Amino acid sequence: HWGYGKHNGPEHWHKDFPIAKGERQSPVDIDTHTAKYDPSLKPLSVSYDQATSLRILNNGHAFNVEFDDSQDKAVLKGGPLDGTYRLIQFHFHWGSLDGQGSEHTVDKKKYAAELHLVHWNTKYGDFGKAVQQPDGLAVLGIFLKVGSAKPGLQKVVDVLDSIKTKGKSADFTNFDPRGLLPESLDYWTYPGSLTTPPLLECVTWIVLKEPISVSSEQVLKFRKLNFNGEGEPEELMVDNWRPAQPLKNRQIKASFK
Numbered sequence: 001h002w003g004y005g006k007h008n009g010p011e012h013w014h015k016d017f018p019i020a021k022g023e024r025q026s027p028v029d030i031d032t033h034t035a036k037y038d039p040s041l042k043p044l045s046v047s048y049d050q051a052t053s054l055r056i057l058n059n060g061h062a063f064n065v066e067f068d069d070s071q072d073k074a075v076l077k078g079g080p081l082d083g084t085y086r087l088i089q090f091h092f093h094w095g096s097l098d099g100q101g102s103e104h105t106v107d108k109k110k111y112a113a114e115l116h117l118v119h120w121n122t123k124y125g126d127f128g129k130a131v132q133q134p135d136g137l138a139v140l141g142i143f144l145k146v147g148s149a150k151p152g153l154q155k156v157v158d159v160l161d162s163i164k165t166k167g168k169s170a171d172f173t174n175f176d177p178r179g180l181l182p183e184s185l186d187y188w189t190y191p192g193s194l195t196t197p198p199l200l201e202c203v204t205w206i207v208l209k210e211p212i213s214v215s216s217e218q219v220l221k222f223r224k225l226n227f228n229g230e231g232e233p234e235e236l237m238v239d240n241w242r243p244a245q246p247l248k249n250r251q252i253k254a255s256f257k
């Protein structure tokens with residue numbers, strides 16, 4: 001019964017998921033002075049023009065915007081990756097206040113939120129098989145700061161009322177995830193894990209340097225979601241982020257100087 005409260009939050013997760021204290025856990029602090037530029041990293045290739053969104057779901061921990069991943073329609077390639085990784089869903093982590101909410105931090109700076117575009121390695125055939133492999137997933141992480149509105153996020157904001165509580169879903173077709181990207185694709189990369197149980201160590205992380213800006217009103221609407229199901233005492237869906245984990249024997253690489 002893991003979650004983000006005092007009694008079931010990230011300091012507890014190790015009791016059901018011992019990998020929580022593992023060698024390549026996520027998120028991490030990105031120390032920008034110690035990350036090394038790696039001139040051998042290729043530019044990233046984000047091919048989302050044929051992306052087919054289907055549905056949006058409140059899963060009790062976050063909301064997921066789900067995609068049709070039965071063919072190579074929206075893929076991530078290049079960068080640190082070998083092969084082709086298919087988009088399956090995106091979600092966010094965010095805070096109760098603008099001073100916190102992101103999972104990765106940059107020189108200990110916390111952003112208001114963090115977007116995760118989750119992709120799986122097509123060499124493993126499906127998502128469930130991919131998460132059992134050390135190179136099974138590529139997660140594109142994008143920070144959110146509060147400032148100007150993000151026009152391409154507003155369709156997401158406007159559907160959240162219809163999925164307020166755990167287990168609720170809604171049709172969510174024709175959403176274009178290109179409208180969530182910053183201008184630059186400069187990134188940091190490192191090997192890590194899912195940041196929620198089961199905390200599997202199967203992720204190549206690709207964290208963009210450039211945040212996107214969202215409005216105060218936009219993030220206030222994320223904070224009206226609920227962790228509870230319908231007809232349960234209201235617990236607002238806020239601070240659904242895991243804090244930074246020990247880097248251990250890992251090097252964070254930069255794509256840029």
Ligand SMILES: [Zn+2]
Pocket residue numbers: 091092093116195
């Ligand atoms: Zn996430």
